[PDB]
Amino acid sequence: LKVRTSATFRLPKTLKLARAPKYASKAVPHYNRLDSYKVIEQPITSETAMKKVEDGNILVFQVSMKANKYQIKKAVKELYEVDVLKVNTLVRPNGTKKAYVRLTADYDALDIANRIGY
Amino acid sequence: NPLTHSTPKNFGIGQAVQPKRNLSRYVKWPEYVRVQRQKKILSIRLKVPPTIAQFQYTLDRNTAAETFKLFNKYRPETAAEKKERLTKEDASPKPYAVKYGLNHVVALIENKKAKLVLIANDVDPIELVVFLPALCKKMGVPYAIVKGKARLGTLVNQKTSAVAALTEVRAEDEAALAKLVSTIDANFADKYDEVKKHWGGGILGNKAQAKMDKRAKN
Amino acid sequence: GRVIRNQRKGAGSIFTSHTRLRQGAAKLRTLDYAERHGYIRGIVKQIVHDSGRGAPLAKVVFRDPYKYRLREEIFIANEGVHTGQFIYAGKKASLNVGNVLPLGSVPEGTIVSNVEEKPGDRGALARASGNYVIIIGHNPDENKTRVRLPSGAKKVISSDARGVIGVIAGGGRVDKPLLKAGRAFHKYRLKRNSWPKTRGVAMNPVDHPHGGGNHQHIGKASTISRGAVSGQKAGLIAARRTGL
Amino acid sequence: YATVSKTHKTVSRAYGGSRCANCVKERIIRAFLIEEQKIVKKV
RNA sequence: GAUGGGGAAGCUCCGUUUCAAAGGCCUGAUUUUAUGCAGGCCACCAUCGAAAGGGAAUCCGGUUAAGAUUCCGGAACCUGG
RNA sequence: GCUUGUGACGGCCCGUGAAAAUCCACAGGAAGGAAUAGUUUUCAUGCCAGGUCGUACUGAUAACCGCAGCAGGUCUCCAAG
RNA sequence: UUGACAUUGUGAAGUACUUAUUCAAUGAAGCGGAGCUGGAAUUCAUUUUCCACGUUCUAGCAUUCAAGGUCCCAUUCGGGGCUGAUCCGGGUU
Ligand SMILES: [Cl-]
Ligand SMILES: [Mg+2]
Ligand SMILES: [Mg+2]
Ligand SMILES: [Mg+2]
Ligand SMILES: [Mg+2]
Ligand SMILES: [Mg+2]
Ligand SMILES: [Mg+2]
Ligand SMILES: [Mg+2]
Ligand SMILES: [Mg+2]
Ligand SMILES: [Mg+2]
Ligand SMILES: [Mg+2]
Numbered sequence: 001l002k003v004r005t006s007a008t009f010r011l012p013k014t015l016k017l018a019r020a021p022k023y024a025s026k027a028v029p030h031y032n033r034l035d036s037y038k039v040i041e042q043p044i045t046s047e048t049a050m051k052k053v054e055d056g057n058i059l060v061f062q063v064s065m066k067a068n069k070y071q072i073k074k075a076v077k078e079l080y081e082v083d084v085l086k087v088n089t090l091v092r093p094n095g096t097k098k099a100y101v102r103l104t105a106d107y108d109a110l111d112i113a114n115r116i117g118y
Numbered sequence: 119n120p121l122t123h124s125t126p127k128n129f130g131i132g133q134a135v136q137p138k139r140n141l142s143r144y145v146k147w148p149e150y151v152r153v154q155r156q157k158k159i160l161s162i163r164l165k166v167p168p169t170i171a172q173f174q175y176t177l178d179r180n181t182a183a184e185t186f187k188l189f190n191k192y193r194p195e196t197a198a199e200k201k202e203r204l205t206k207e208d209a210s211p212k213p214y215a216v217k218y219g220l221n222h223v224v225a226l227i228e229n230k231k232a233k234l235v236l237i238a239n240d241v242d243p244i245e246l247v248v249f250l251p252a253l254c255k256k257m258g259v260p261y262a263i264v265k266g267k268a269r270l271g272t273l274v275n276q277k278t279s280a281v282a283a284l285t286e287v288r289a290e291d292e293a294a295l296a297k298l299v300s301t302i303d304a305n306f307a308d309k310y311d312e313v314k315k316h317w318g319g320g321i322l323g324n325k326a327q328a329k330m331d332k333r334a335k336n
Numbered sequence: 337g338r339v340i341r342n343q344r345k346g347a348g349s350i351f352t353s354h355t356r357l358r359q360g361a362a363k364l365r366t367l368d369y370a371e372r373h374g375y376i377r378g379i380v381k382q383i384v385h386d387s388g389r390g391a392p393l394a395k396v397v398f399r400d401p402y403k404y405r406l407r408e409e410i411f412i413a414n415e416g417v418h419t420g421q422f423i424y425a426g427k428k429a430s431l432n433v434g435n436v437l438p439l440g441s442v443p444e445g446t447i448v449s450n451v452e453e454k455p456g457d458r459g460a461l462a463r464a465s466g467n468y469v470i471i472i473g474h475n476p477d478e479n480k481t482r483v484r485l486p487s488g489a490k491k492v493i494s495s496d497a498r499g500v501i502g503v504i505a506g507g508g509r510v511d512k513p514l515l516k517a518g519r520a521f522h523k524y525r526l527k528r529n530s531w532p533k534t535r536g537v538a539m540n541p542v543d544h545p546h547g548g549g550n551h552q553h554i555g556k557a558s559t560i561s562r563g564a565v566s567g568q569k570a571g572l573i574a575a576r577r578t579g580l
Numbered sequence: 581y582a583t584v585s586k587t588h589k590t591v592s593r594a595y596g597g598s599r600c601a602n603c604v605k606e607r608i609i610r611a612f613l614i615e616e617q618k619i620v621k622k623v
Numbered sequence: 624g625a626u627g628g629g630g631a632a633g634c635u636c637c638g639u640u641u642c643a644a645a646g647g648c649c650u651g652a653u654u655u656u657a658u659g660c661a662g663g664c665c666a667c668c669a670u671c672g673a674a675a676g677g678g679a680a681u682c683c684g685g686u687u688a689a690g691a692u693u694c695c696g697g698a699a700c701c702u703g704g
Numbered sequence: 705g706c707u708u709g710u711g712a713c714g715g716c717c718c719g720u721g722a723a724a725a726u727c728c729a730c731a732g733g734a735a736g737g738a739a740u741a742g743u744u745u746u747c748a749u750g751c752c753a754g755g756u757c758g759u760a761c762u763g764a765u766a767a768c769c770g771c772a773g774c775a776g777g778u779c780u781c782c783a784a785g
Numbered sequence: 786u787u788g789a790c791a792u793u794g795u796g797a798a799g800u801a802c803u804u805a806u807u808c809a810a811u812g813a814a815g816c817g818g819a820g821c822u823g824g825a826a827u828u829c830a831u832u833u834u835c836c837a838c839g840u841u842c843u844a845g846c847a848u849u850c851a852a853g854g855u856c857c858c859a860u861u862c863g864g865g866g867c868u869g870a871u872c873c874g875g876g877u878u
Contacts, residue, residue: 001142001875002142003140003142004140004141004142004145005138005139005140005141005850006141006812007141007144007145007146007811007812007813007814007877008145008146008666008812008813009145009146009147009148009644010644010645010646010666011644011645011646012644015659048687051687052694055695056694056695058694068755068756069755069756070755088693090693090759091757091758093760100694102694122852122853123852123853124852124853124854125851125852126851126852126853126869127851127869127870128839128840129839129870130374130839130840131369131370131373131374131375131376131401131426131839131840132370132374132375132376132377132839133839133840133847134847135400135401135402135403135404135847135848136401136402136814136815137850137851137870138850139815139870141813141814141815142875143815143816143874143875143876143877144813144814144815144816144875144877144878145813145875145877146811146812146813146877147644147813148643148644149642149643149644150644151644155875156804156876159876160804160805162804163803163804164794164795164803164804164805165794165795320795322802322803323803323804323874323876324817324818324874324875324876325816325817325818325874325876326802326803326876327818328817328818329817330802331818332818356722356723357720357721357722366810366811367810367811367878368811368814368815369815373815374840375840375841376840377840377841379844380844381844384720385720387719387720387721390718401814402814403848404847404848405848420843420844421844422841422843422844424841429841430841432841454808454809456809456810456811456878457809457810458810465718506718509718510718514718519717519718519719520718522717522718522719523718523719525719526719581727581729582679582727582728582746583679583701583746584728584746585746586729586746587746589728589729589746590729590730594730594731595729595730595731596730597728597729597730598729598730598731599730606844606845607846608845610843610844610845610846611845611846612845613843613845614843614846615845615846617842617843
């Protein structure tokens with residue numbers, strides 16, 4: 001007989017095998033649900049928003065409701081080849097998300113805005 | 119040696135913390151463990167009727183070893199041996215093998231064809247085999263209650279067999295079979311009348327036995 | 337009629353005990369190897385007030401026999417027990433106030449409290465303030481002990497049952513008049529919802545068997561038999577006698 | 581307390597920051613005298 | 624208010640650590656590869672429940688038609704790495 | 705002086721006036737460690753990041769509830785001569 | 786609430802047992818029997834019996850499979866048996 005110093009019996013540890021399915025779950029992986037073109041929807045060109053471009057060096061965009069600040073910062077850099085200092089976001093009363101993107105001092109928001117087309 | 123010291127510990131009540139001891143006697147075992155141990159106890163505390171109590175007697179080690187030695191000479195052919203026989207094929211000699219199967223063996227006993235029947239003592243639905251000693255006694259077929267349904271199965275290439283019988287033995291083994299039958303008959307067939315009148319069980323527990331013995335003495 | 341007041345208490349909705357401020361259940365140590373063979377020493381760390389309980393409680397710390405740690409127990413303090421005192425519990429403990437001993441290890445006439453009805457239930461008898469149990473005799477055959485209970489009844493208890501030497505502290509509490517409804521309010525605020533009490537004769541017949549009538553009166557004998565059913569047992573239940 | 585140095589949270593003595601000096605003094609004296617008393621009880 | 628269990632023809636009811644084999648972080652072992660495998664530790668044993676209870680850390684000045692202890696300027700602090 | 709914070713005290717109870725997450729210290733001594741070399745990120749300085757949702761306004765003899773732009777009802781902070 | 790039947794067995798006399806059933810406790814830790822060691826003890830040939838068998842002036846301290854003793858490894862930084870801590874029955878009490 002074994003020596004049991006404890007009077008409590010516990011469930012023994014047994015081998016657990018990883019899954020080895022014989023057919024794939026879906027067989028076609030889905031493409032990126034949030035790429036750069038889905039994160040950034042369209043610029044906002046209101047009079048108040050345009051005042052922040054040449055004065056505050058800040059670009060204003062309408063973004064998807066599913067995008068966080070990490071994704072917004074990454075999308076702006078890839079689409080426009082600029083550097084982002086910080087991102088501030090809010091949910092508008094009409095159900096859309098607006099992001100205040102401030103570029104670093106090495107870039108001018110007005111030059112980027114003209115290149116985009118607005 | 120000059121730096122080491124002897125500092126015995128005091129393990130009395132109120133002294134140092136008790137050391138690790140073997141607590142296997144006090145282990146809170148799982149539910150399935152307790153029920154199978156208490157099932158054994160309950161069946162022996164009650165009085166066992168003679169029909170069931172006759173299965174407490176099994177063939178002794180010496181004669182059982184000789185019994186399986188003879189039966190191991192008549193193993194049924196395996197599937198591998200079956201394949202070679204089929205491709206060769208009355209081109210094959212008459213086979214000699216141990217008969218098994220509860221329905222098959224019972225029919226053999228009723229037709230006076232079994233020369234020796236082995237009975238397992240571990241059949242949980244005991245009614246399956248509880249009538250065999252009486253049936254063999256009525257038909258005059260010698261029988262032996264042997265220990266291990268797993269051991270009976272291993273000589274017929276099965277996990278369990280619960281019964282085995284020899285109907286026809288080769289000439290070179292006639293003397294060995296007759297020697298075994300005489301030894302087996304003296305233990306089971308010849309004692310059937312007296313065993314049928316004896317009840318089993320009624321054994322007390324270890325602590326209850328001491329209490330009864332103490333009262334008897336003083 | 338409708339369900340009467342004493343029937344509604346069993347549902348336990350607003351009639352449960354108010355146990356937020358309770359210090360904990362007051363129990364003896366679990367009967368173990370040290371208690372039934374020798375003794376174990378504890379120390380009184382503090383004596384504290386318990387909400388809803390007249391008698392004070394004592395916190396006693398013992399060492400764990402099988403593990404390196406400390407185990408704290410909640411006892412009902414007896415008169416004379418003080419902080420820093422050593423408490424001895426077990427079969428081989430001395431006959432001193434505060435010690436816990438089996439009933440069969442003390443002589444006749446010993447005063448004990450927090451007595452076990454059965455060995456190991458950790459105290460059931462003589463727990464209220466100023467109450468005690470008197471041991472009146474021993475029966476070494478069958479291992480039984482005869483005691484007198486605070487109500488005056490005589491009970492036969494096993495000699496292995498434990499008890500604390502002394503008398504429950506805080507006695508004399510009920511000798512002081514409450515003197516105002518406000519003090520009664522604060523008393524039951526820490527116990528349960530049973531105060532104030534409206535008399536049955538002041539109710540309507542739908543509310544109570546005593547209700548109704550052009551005068552306030554019961555109208556039938558208030559002595560109710562033991563065999564009555566719920567909704568009828570109001571008044572004096574199975575009274576052997578009445579009057580002063 | 582996690583933002584300050586260990587100096588602010590202890591005193592250079594046994595049980596520093598846990599027990600005061602007088603309580604530590606009582607523990608040392610009690611420990612010595614009791615252990616001496618146990619020897620005379622042994623013999 | 625789930626689970627384990629016990630009720631109920633059943634929708635469901637009881638109960639919350641309960642008659643349960645109820646679980647995972649410090650590593651050592653391995654340079655075939657990622658963690659199989661050696662001791663021990665700990666048994667607490669779902670979860671929900673506060674924009675007035677408990678609680679890591681920011682201030683001043685300026686700026687709009689409507690925003691700010693959230694933006695701008697300056698000056699700090701906390702947590703994780 | 706007013707408002708408020710706080711300290712040391714005093715009166716009162718058959719009323720003696722939450723819990724948990726979380727952080728720290730101590731006891732203990734398992735391990736790891738120096739001479740041509742190491743440990744301390746509980747001393748100082750330096751580097752990086754900090755997601756998600758709410759945030760406008762009324763708060764009442766006109767933005768809440770009473771069929772309404774109803775003399776009704778609806779919790780609270782600041783308080784000059 | 787009272788009676789009958791079933792659950793429902795076992796032994797004795799003119800109540801006894803255990804196993805069903807019921808109650809309670811413990812993260813089922815020390816139960817039952819026996820053997821050591823001593824005491825009481827009076828022996829009517831030897832132990833016919835019974836008890837105990839590490840802890841009480843003091844608000845300290847008590848944890849690293851335990852030091853010691855002894856037996857192995859193939860000596861390295863260590864490791865493993867037995868004893869310390871008496872045996873037997875696996876009925877947690
Ligand atoms: Cl009522
Ligand atoms: Mg925001
Ligand atoms: Mg009225
Ligand atoms: Mg009525
Ligand atoms: Mg009436
Ligand atoms: Mg429920
Ligand atoms: Mg929550
Ligand atoms: Mg504003
Ligand atoms: Mg606002
Ligand atoms: Mg409305
Ligand atoms: Mg309406």
